[PDB]
Enzyme design. Structure first.
Site, PDB file in Angstrom:
ATOM      1  CB  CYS A 108      -1.024   0.022   1.134  1.00  0.00           C
ATOM      2  SG  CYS A 108      -1.979   1.567   1.190  1.00  0.00           S
ATOM      3  NE  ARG A 111       2.289   0.706   3.532  1.00  0.00           N
ATOM      4  CZ  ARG A 111       3.390  -0.020   3.644  1.00  0.00           C
ATOM      5  NH1 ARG A 111       3.661  -0.623   4.789  1.00  0.00           N
ATOM      6  NH2 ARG A 111       4.243  -0.127   2.632  1.00  0.00           N
ATOM      7  CD1 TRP A 280      -6.955   9.356  -2.237  1.00  0.00           C
ATOM      8  CD2 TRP A 280      -8.101   9.499  -0.287  1.00  0.00           C
ATOM      9  NE1 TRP A 280      -6.107   9.879  -1.282  1.00  0.00           N
ATOM     10  CE2 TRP A 280      -6.737   9.975  -0.098  1.00  0.00           C
ATOM     11  CE3 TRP A 280      -8.967   9.498   0.798  1.00  0.00           C
ATOM     12  CZ2 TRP A 280      -6.287  10.433   1.145  1.00  0.00           C
ATOM     13  CZ3 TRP A 280      -8.499   9.966   2.034  1.00  0.00           C
ATOM     14  CH2 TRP A 280      -7.200  10.450   2.185  1.00  0.00           C
ATOM     15  CD  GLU A 285      -5.783   2.526  -7.085  1.00  0.00           C
ATOM     16  OE1 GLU A 285      -6.344   1.434  -6.824  1.00  0.00           O
ATOM     17  OE2 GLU A 285      -5.794   3.527  -6.308  1.00  0.00           O
TER      18      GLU A 285
HETATM   19  C1  HEM Z   1      -6.361   6.564   1.618  1.00  0.00           C
HETATM   20  C2  HEM Z   1      -6.115   6.434   0.341  1.00  0.00           C
HETATM   21  C3  HEM Z   1      -5.458   5.247  -0.212  1.00  0.00           C
HETATM   22  C4  HEM Z   1      -4.731   5.257  -1.451  1.00  0.00           C
HETATM   23  C5  HEM Z   1      -4.520   6.330  -2.505  1.00  0.00           C
HETATM   24  C6  HEM Z   1      -4.205   3.877  -1.406  1.00  0.00           C
HETATM   25  C7  HEM Z   1      -3.523   3.434  -2.564  1.00  0.00           C
HETATM   26  C8  HEM Z   1      -3.271   2.041  -2.841  1.00  0.00           C
HETATM   27  C9  HEM Z   1      -2.889   1.562  -4.178  1.00  0.00           C
HETATM   28  C10 HEM Z   1      -2.592   2.398  -5.383  1.00  0.00           C
HETATM   29  C11 HEM Z   1      -2.704   0.126  -4.008  1.00  0.00           C
HETATM   30  C12 HEM Z   1      -2.316  -0.859  -5.069  1.00  0.00           C
HETATM   31  C13 HEM Z   1      -3.701  -1.252  -5.621  1.00  0.00           C
HETATM   32  C14 HEM Z   1      -3.683  -2.040  -6.928  1.00  0.00           C
HETATM   33  O1  HEM Z   1      -2.759  -1.985  -7.753  1.00  0.00           O
HETATM   34  O2  HEM Z   1      -4.661  -2.772  -7.147  1.00  0.00           O
HETATM   35  C15 HEM Z   1      -3.062  -0.174  -2.615  1.00  0.00           C
HETATM   36  C16 HEM Z   1      -3.012  -1.515  -2.050  1.00  0.00           C
HETATM   37  C17 HEM Z   1      -3.499  -1.857  -0.728  1.00  0.00           C
HETATM   38  N1  HEM Z   1      -4.004  -0.949   0.107  1.00  0.00           N
HETATM   39 FE1  HEM Z   1      -4.008   1.123   0.030  1.00  0.00          FE
HETATM   40  N2  HEM Z   1      -4.578   3.065  -0.411  1.00  0.00           N
HETATM   41  C18 HEM Z   1      -5.255   3.904   0.382  1.00  0.00           C
HETATM   42  C19 HEM Z   1      -5.952   3.496   1.592  1.00  0.00           C
HETATM   43  C20 HEM Z   1      -6.006   2.167   2.130  1.00  0.00           C
HETATM   44  C21 HEM Z   1      -6.800   1.830   3.326  1.00  0.00           C
HETATM   45  C22 HEM Z   1      -7.693   2.769   4.131  1.00  0.00           C
HETATM   46  C23 HEM Z   1      -6.506   0.418   3.511  1.00  0.00           C
HETATM   47  C24 HEM Z   1      -6.971  -0.455   4.615  1.00  0.00           C
HETATM   48  C25 HEM Z   1      -7.610   0.045   5.684  1.00  0.00           C
HETATM   49  C26 HEM Z   1      -5.565   0.011   2.454  1.00  0.00           C
HETATM   50  C27 HEM Z   1      -5.014  -1.315   2.304  1.00  0.00           C
HETATM   51  C28 HEM Z   1      -4.315  -1.739   1.141  1.00  0.00           C
HETATM   52  C29 HEM Z   1      -4.141  -3.192   0.996  1.00  0.00           C
HETATM   53  C30 HEM Z   1      -4.467  -4.310   1.980  1.00  0.00           C
HETATM   54  C31 HEM Z   1      -3.550  -3.269  -0.325  1.00  0.00           C
HETATM   55  C32 HEM Z   1      -3.035  -4.508  -1.063  1.00  0.00           C
HETATM   56  C33 HEM Z   1      -4.088  -5.288  -1.778  1.00  0.00           C
HETATM   57  C34 HEM Z   1      -3.539  -6.558  -2.392  1.00  0.00           C
HETATM   58  O3  HEM Z   1      -2.494  -7.093  -1.983  1.00  0.00           O
HETATM   59  O4  HEM Z   1      -4.202  -7.043  -3.334  1.00  0.00           O
HETATM   60  N3  HEM Z   1      -5.339   1.059   1.493  1.00  0.00           N
HETATM   61  N4  HEM Z   1      -3.516   0.988  -1.895  1.00  0.00           N
HETATM   62  N1  LIG Z   2      -6.624 -11.696 -11.975  1.00  0.00           N
HETATM   63  C1  LIG Z   2      -6.049 -10.495 -11.856  1.00  0.00           C
HETATM   64  N2  LIG Z   2      -5.777  -9.845 -10.701  1.00  0.00           N
HETATM   65  C2  LIG Z   2      -5.794 -10.293  -9.403  1.00  0.00           C
HETATM   66  C3  LIG Z   2      -6.150 -11.567  -8.939  1.00  0.00           C
HETATM   67  C4  LIG Z   2      -6.145 -11.873  -7.574  1.00  0.00           C
HETATM   68  C5  LIG Z   2      -5.770 -10.914  -6.644  1.00  0.00           C
HETATM   69  C6  LIG Z   2      -5.408  -9.655  -7.097  1.00  0.00           C
HETATM   70  C7  LIG Z   2      -5.011  -8.603  -6.105  1.00  0.00           C
HETATM   71  O1  LIG Z   2      -5.346  -7.300  -6.593  1.00  0.00           O
HETATM   72  C8  LIG Z   2      -6.727  -7.011  -6.637  1.00  0.00           C
HETATM   73  C9  LIG Z   2      -6.893  -5.509  -6.861  1.00  0.00           C
HETATM   74  C10 LIG Z   2      -7.539  -5.300  -8.249  1.00  0.00           C
HETATM   75  N3  LIG Z   2      -8.685  -6.164  -8.465  1.00  0.00           N
HETATM   76  O2  LIG Z   2      -7.643  -5.002  -5.730  1.00  0.00           O
HETATM   77  C11 LIG Z   2      -7.978  -3.641  -5.856  1.00  0.00           C
HETATM   78  C12 LIG Z   2      -7.381  -2.753  -4.793  1.00  0.00           C
HETATM   79  C13 LIG Z   2      -6.842  -3.230  -3.614  1.00  0.00           C
HETATM   80  C14 LIG Z   2      -6.344  -2.295  -2.695  1.00  0.00           C
HETATM   81  C15 LIG Z   2      -6.408  -0.924  -2.940  1.00  0.00           C
HETATM   82  C16 LIG Z   2      -6.978  -0.450  -4.132  1.00  0.00           C
HETATM   83  N4  LIG Z   2      -7.193   0.864  -4.432  1.00  0.00           N
HETATM   84  C17 LIG Z   2      -7.414   1.831  -3.573  1.00  0.00           C
HETATM   85  N5  LIG Z   2      -7.078   3.065  -3.926  1.00  0.00           N
HETATM   86  C18 LIG Z   2      -8.055   1.525  -2.279  1.00  0.00           C
HETATM   87  C19 LIG Z   2      -9.081   0.621  -2.028  1.00  0.00           C
HETATM   88  C20 LIG Z   2      -9.488   0.671  -0.696  1.00  0.00           C
HETATM   89  C21 LIG Z   2      -8.808   1.656   0.057  1.00  0.00           C
HETATM   90  S1  LIG Z   2      -7.672   2.525  -0.926  1.00  0.00           S
HETATM   91  C22 LIG Z   2      -7.477  -1.383  -5.038  1.00  0.00           C
HETATM   92  C23 LIG Z   2      -5.412  -9.350  -8.452  1.00  0.00           C
HETATM   93  C24 LIG Z   2      -5.554  -9.852 -13.121  1.00  0.00           C
HETATM   94  C25 LIG Z   2      -4.338  -9.232 -13.438  1.00  0.00           C
HETATM   95  C26 LIG Z   2      -4.255  -8.761 -14.766  1.00  0.00           C
HETATM   96  C27 LIG Z   2      -5.414  -9.018 -15.493  1.00  0.00           C
HETATM   97  S2  LIG Z   2      -6.580  -9.850 -14.512  1.00  0.00           S
END
Ligand code: HEM
Ligand SMILES: N=C(Nc1cccc(COC[C@@H](CN)OCc2cccc(/N=C(/N)c3cccs3)c2)c1)c1cccs1
Ligand code: HEM
Ligand SMILES: N=C(Nc1cccc(COC[C@@H](CN)OCc2cccc(/N=C(/N)c3cccs3)c2)c1)c1cccs1
Ligand SMILES: C[C@H](O)[C@H](O)[C@H]1CNc2nc(N)[nH]c(=O)c2N1
Ligand SMILES: C[C@H](O)[C@H](O)[C@H]1CNc2nc(N)[nH]c(=O)c2N1
Ligand SMILES: [Zn+2]
Lengths: 411, 407
Positions: A108, A111, A280, A285
């Site tokens: 993330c 953070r 947000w 993204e």
């Molecule tokens: C406040 C604004 C926030 C922004 C701009 C932010 C931004 C991001 C971005 C850009 C990613 C990568 C997402 C992707 O490629 O799919 C991410 C991942 C993550 N964020 Fe943050 N985030 C924020 C808040 C939070 C909050 C509030 C939580 C939990 C309370 C959080 C927990 C995580 C987790 C657990 C992942 C990893 C998900 C995974 O492994 O699939 N985020 N966040």
């Molecule tokens: N199967 C796919 N992806 C995939 C499969 C299993 C797990 C994952 C893990 O990533 C999931 C991703 C995208 N779906 O979750 C979205 C995400 C997670 C955390 C933060 C995100 N964005 C944010 N800005 C926030 C959300 C909540 C608070 S901040 C957005 C991804 C693919 C990859 C390429 C084509 S399909």
């Protein structure tokens, strides 16, 4: 043991000791690095050490380590575990736990914000209708007419594994995807399988390109139930470009509130299988991944066509050109409608300041480079040049299997 | 023990068995991943020799033949006797090609089998090294139709007789600190530039001065040589739509040639093994030109484009970046100097990985290095899971010679 990380742009060297508190495994060994791999019922035995480790962390944070209140709380939890086989968190511990799971989330980039998280305690919830009501309230609170506020809603913890609370949606707000007979996809291809489940469960699909999916909600291990989020609570932004007036006619929009609903929150050995959280967006993204991935909306060609770029050779960098314009459009649109968004330059600069602050006060900041570096313009952001150490701390957010693969259908 | 990697764009899944051959360590443990960290006797030598000769004889389909056994005996005899051994030409060539094949950070390995190996093990002096290097430069440049090559100087013996090229690359530009406080030319090379001056180079004190070679033969003090300018193919940088671009005064050299790495084959160490190929466009346009600690021209270009530089969210840096990179490719292409764009190079690498999985059981790959420094997710390598592990023969880093050398 001390470990050093260097930033190769600034020559700042930081020293990690926090890694010493890591317990969980990474996937890597001395012979193999798995750093690019996307995914690399508890007994009393394993539970009381996990509870103890967590309460020791909590009590240290409030400067009450070893106090009578600390010792009494450990004794109380210990007895509760041996009597009832589990335990309940106090409100204060739940809040600390949810914030720390975010603080510990190595993938993330956002953070810097970790200490500002609105925690909604939904552990008194019993039915899917009850979950729907909690989720609407979360969405309305988090949305705040465009001035987005981070929040998490925490449903009851796992008990025997047969009574799980689950949100079947991957995000609270997402667009439907529909596979056509000719093999093309209408809407978002990432959500085709989930869309199919919804339809089977009785959803009447409008079959458009941007249909907000219904919530599919499972309380207490029962079969999930469908609900439609009131449209008045779903804030959306039509996408336009500040210079290119044809951009609006692409018919694009996106939703403002990113809200992840399929992860598992682990606090002190307890498992919260439904814990939707929201913040947000970072602009990339939507503009890079959601719009320009080949497996998603895949708009690069159509945009490059309209810009009249040279598409005969990749070496014109037509894809790269179209990519930047789309991303300008996403940021312009959100900003113009006063919906919170952060660009990848600002987000990464803030993350570097966060990380340095954490090394100084906490002794470390686990970070996953593969995920922290943005999917465009990587090396002109400061994170590309920052060495990072990835390790797993608890409390944590974890993946869990999709519920349709494990659910026992009652009928 | 058998490992799977998935491409998330195409769903293609490959199974890796080749990692089980790995011997050297990664930096990572089960508790900590160091994937983004840039740098993590007679008794020793025979196992290393045997491991290598075993893969060599297997590669020519003669594993367990008389010639294989006899070779192992011969080398075993020679280590016992001399404390080292000499590779046959055929082994040296195979080893060098495999050092490239095994380079987990290299996106260009589809080419690995087309490498010209220049055997310079008969070399004894710095003038001789200069001669071999000039011949390599000319051969590889091939008037802009670049060809991959490596020149291999004598292997380490007791470690007080090392051959080294002090330069980090054969061709690079000088860097000078000014009283001004700013840096003229390439800041990456300020220290080396001053070592050259200290040894007696007459620097012209310009923005794009080709550095002299500083060459160390046989552990002796290193000596300066200018590469004949006629052998250094350079490209003035211009843009196909913006006429003012050329006014920036930018140029780059055509031949990327790394000279500071160590080649390990069969336990033997080749401390001077300059190798060359050709550029991927982003190396020059994104890293050399736009890194904050390099030529750092983003501000100046954005200005000539008249972009709104008030706010980061206008993506002015990003817009300028794309245009610089379009210009780099256009300039090389116009002047007929081989260059590859990041889209083409990464597509080829995916095809190479599939070939290697099929024919060899895997392909070690470092995702952090393989994914280009711009437009990452629109290249197929972003979506490709990769396993990183260390196979030998290999190229390795080694300490800079000025920190080691005993004058
Ligand atoms: C406040 C604004 C926030 C922004 C701009 C932010 C931004 C991001 C971005 C850009 C990613 C990568 C997402 C992707 O490629 O799919 C991410 C991942 C993550 N964020 Fe943050 N985030 C924020 C808040 C939070 C909050 C509030 C939580 C939990 C309370 C959080 C927990 C995580 C987790 C657990 C992942 C990893 C998900 C995974 O492994 O699939 N985020 N966040
Ligand atoms: N199967 C796919 N992806 C995939 C499969 C299993 C797990 C994952 C893990 O990533 C999931 C991703 C995208 N779906 O979750 C979205 C995400 C997670 C955390 C933060 C995100 N964005 C944010 N800005 C926030 C959300 C909540 C608070 S901040 C957005 C991804 C693919 C990859 C390429 C084509 S399909
Ligand atoms: C033929 C064209 C070639 C292309 C286009 C190519 C491309 C690349 C690129 C883009 C990098 C990353 C460099 C950086 O970011 O600084 C790289 C790394 C590497 N390449 Fe290749 N390469 C090619 C040929 C070769 C050859 C011929 C060899 C050896 C014989 C080789 C060995 C390596 C090694 C060892 C690294 C990593 C260096 C390190 O870890 O610091 N390359 N290559
Ligand atoms: N101190 C820094 N970096 C650094 C320090 C120590 C080691 C390293 C490792 O990278 C070495 C890099 C250049 N710095 O090596 C250049 C290289 C290696 C391999 C391939 C390259 N490009 C090619 N196309 C080829 C060359 C030969 C055949 S193909 C280019 C990098 C800096 C970071 C930012 C500014 S300076
Ligand atoms: C800290 C980080 O490992 C470092 O900046 C890396 C990232 N990826 C890279 N990738 C390539 N190809 N070349 C590099 O020099 C680097 N630098
Ligand atoms: C295989 C590879 O790990 C995968 O494509 C990753 C790379 N980096 C990422 N980074 C972010 N922030 N989000 C992602 O989905 C991914 N995908
Ligand atoms: Zn690792």
């Amino acid at each position: 043991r001390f470990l050093k990380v260097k930033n190769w742009e600034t020559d700042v060297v930081l020293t990690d000791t926090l890694h010493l508190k890591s317990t969980l495994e990474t996937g890597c060994t001395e012979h193999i690095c798995m750093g690019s791999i996307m995914l690399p019922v508890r007994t009393k035995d394993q539970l009381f050490p996990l509870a103890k480790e967590f309460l020791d962390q909590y009590y240290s944070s409030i400067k009450r380590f070893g106090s009578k209140a600390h010792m009494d709380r450990l004794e109380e939890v210990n007895k509760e575990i041996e009597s009832t086989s589990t335990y309940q968190l106090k409100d204060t511990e739940l809040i600390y736990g949810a914030k720390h799971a975010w603080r510990n989330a190595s993938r993330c980039v956002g953070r810097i914000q970790w200490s500002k998280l609105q925690v909604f305690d939904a552990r008194d919830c019993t039915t899917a209708h009850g979950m729907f009501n909690y989720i609407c309230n979360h969405v309305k609170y988090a949305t705040n007419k465009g001035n987005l506020r981070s929040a998490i809603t925490i449903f009851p913890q796992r008990t025997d594994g047969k009574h799980d609370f689950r949100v079947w949606n991957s995000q609270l707000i997402r667009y439907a995807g529909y596979k056509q007979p000719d093999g093309s996809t209408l809407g978002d291809p990432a959500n085709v399988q989930f869309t199919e489940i919804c339809i089977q469960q009785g959803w009447k699909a409008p079959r458009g390109r941007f249909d907000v999916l219904p919530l599919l909600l499972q309380a207490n291990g029962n079969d999930p139930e469908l609900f439609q989020i009131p449209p008045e609570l779903v804030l959306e932004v039509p996408i336009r470009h500040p210079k290119f007036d044809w951009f609006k006619d692409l018919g694009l929009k996106w939703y403002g509130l990113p809200a992840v609903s399929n992860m598992l929150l682990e606090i002190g050995g307890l498992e919260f299988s439904a814990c939707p959280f929201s913040g947000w967006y970072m602009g990339t993204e939507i503009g890079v991944r959601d719009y320009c991935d080949n497996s998603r909306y895949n708009i690069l060609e159509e945009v490059a066509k309209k810009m009249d770029l040279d598409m005969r050779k990749t070496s014109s960098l037509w894809k790269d050109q179209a990519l930047v314009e789309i991303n300008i459009a996403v940021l312009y649109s959100f900003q113009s409608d006063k919906v919170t968004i952060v660009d990848h330059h600002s987000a990464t600069e803030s993350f570097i300041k966060h990380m340095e602050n954490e090394y100084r006060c906490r002794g470390g900041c686990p970070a996953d480079w593969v995920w922290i570096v943005p999917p465009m313009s990587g090396s002109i952001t400061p994170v590309f040049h920052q060495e990072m150490l990835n390790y797993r701390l608890t409390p944590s957010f974890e993946y869990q299997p999709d519920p349709w693969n494990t659910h026992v259908w009652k009928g």
